[PDB]
């Protein structure tokens, strides 16, 4: 609605009373992605989920299990270690539906490269298992 | 507060007053992820950060350094090249806390595959280094 300069007090109130629905829906939600520290990565269900210490709760209360994100379907990449930082999104803004992805910090520093742009440096602290059905 | 059809001007005003706070917090923030063109990838700090030309500033002003996201902890994948497009999220909606991931575009085209769904095609323009501590 084009609530221009020549607008009555009632027109302005009506405009506010109609466009505030999105704000009401956002209440009690989680709008932006967050940065968190991984505190638990032993998932009893084997679903590669981790627990975080998000700054909202100030490490007082433990959070809910946070599910991983992968680039392709059939890769199970190494999980973040304890005290490593991840970025967490909340599906539909629900604090109980969080999905994470590791970031580059110092507990997770950058690997040495000759050319940081084109070269690829990868380290695995466990076994590496690659199985290819085709050529 | 169920603000039904039978409501006074004061009840509606109170509903607006109690509800616009999330929208006030949203002011001067970045709500959605953005698409941007990478203009600088030489990070003097060695933190694999890149500079972008986001459409908000119309390539008039340079942006802040934007940090990468990885799927694994000890993976240091090749960085986006100059003039390539990435998707950027802003933690807590802050413009100065940005985290990026490259996407498939034209400066970033799709690799040739026999099966586009199941096949994996990877090219590295620099050195490739893999270290496995276990088997």
């Amino acid at each position: 609605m084009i609530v221009d300069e020549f607008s009555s007090v009632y027109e302005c109130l009506l405009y506010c009373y109609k466009m505030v629905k999105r704000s009401e829906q956002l209440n009690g939600r989680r709008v932006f992605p967050i940065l968190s520290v991984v505190t638990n990565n032993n998932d009893p269900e084997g679903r590669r989920r981790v627990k975080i210490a998000d700054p909202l709760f100030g490490n007082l209360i433990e959070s809910n299990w946070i599910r991983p994100i992968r680039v392709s379907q059939n890769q199970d990449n190494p999980l973040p270690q304890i005290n490593q930082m991840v970025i967490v999104w909340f599906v539909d803004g629900d604090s109980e539906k969080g999905y994470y992805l590791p970031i580059i910090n110092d507990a997770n520093p950058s690997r040495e490269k000759d050319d940081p742009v084109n070269d690829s440096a990868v380290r695995i602290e466990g076994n590496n298992t690659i199985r290819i059905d085709k050529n | 507060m169920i603000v039904d059809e039978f409501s006074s001007v004061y009840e509606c005003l109170l509903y607006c007053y109690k509800m616009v706070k999330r929208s006030e917090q949203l002011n001067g923030r970045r709500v959605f992820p953005i698409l941007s063109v990478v203009t600088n990838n030489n990070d003097p700090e060695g933190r694999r950060r890149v500079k972008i030309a986001d459409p908000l500033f119309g390539n008039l002003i340079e942006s802040n350094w934007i940090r990468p996201i990885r799927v694994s902890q000890n993976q240091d994948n090749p960085l986006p090249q100059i003039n390539q497009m990435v998707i950027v999220w802003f933690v807590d909606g802050d413009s100065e806390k940005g985290y990026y991931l490259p996407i498939i575009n034209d400066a970033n085209p799709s690799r040739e595959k026999d099966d586009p769904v199941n096949d994996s095609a990877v090219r590295i323009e620099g050195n490739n280094t893999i270290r496995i501590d276990k088997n």
Binding site: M1, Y10, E11, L13, L14 | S8, V9, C12
Partner: peptide, 24 residues
């Protein structure tokens, strides 16, 4: 005084109902 305060409040309420049903 309070009679008119109430009258004015009711006027405002009905004026707002006018506006609610004035706009598409």
């Amino acid at each position: 005084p309070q009679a008119i305060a109430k009258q004015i409040a009711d006027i405002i309420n009905s004026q707002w109902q006018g506006t609610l049903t004035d706009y598409a």
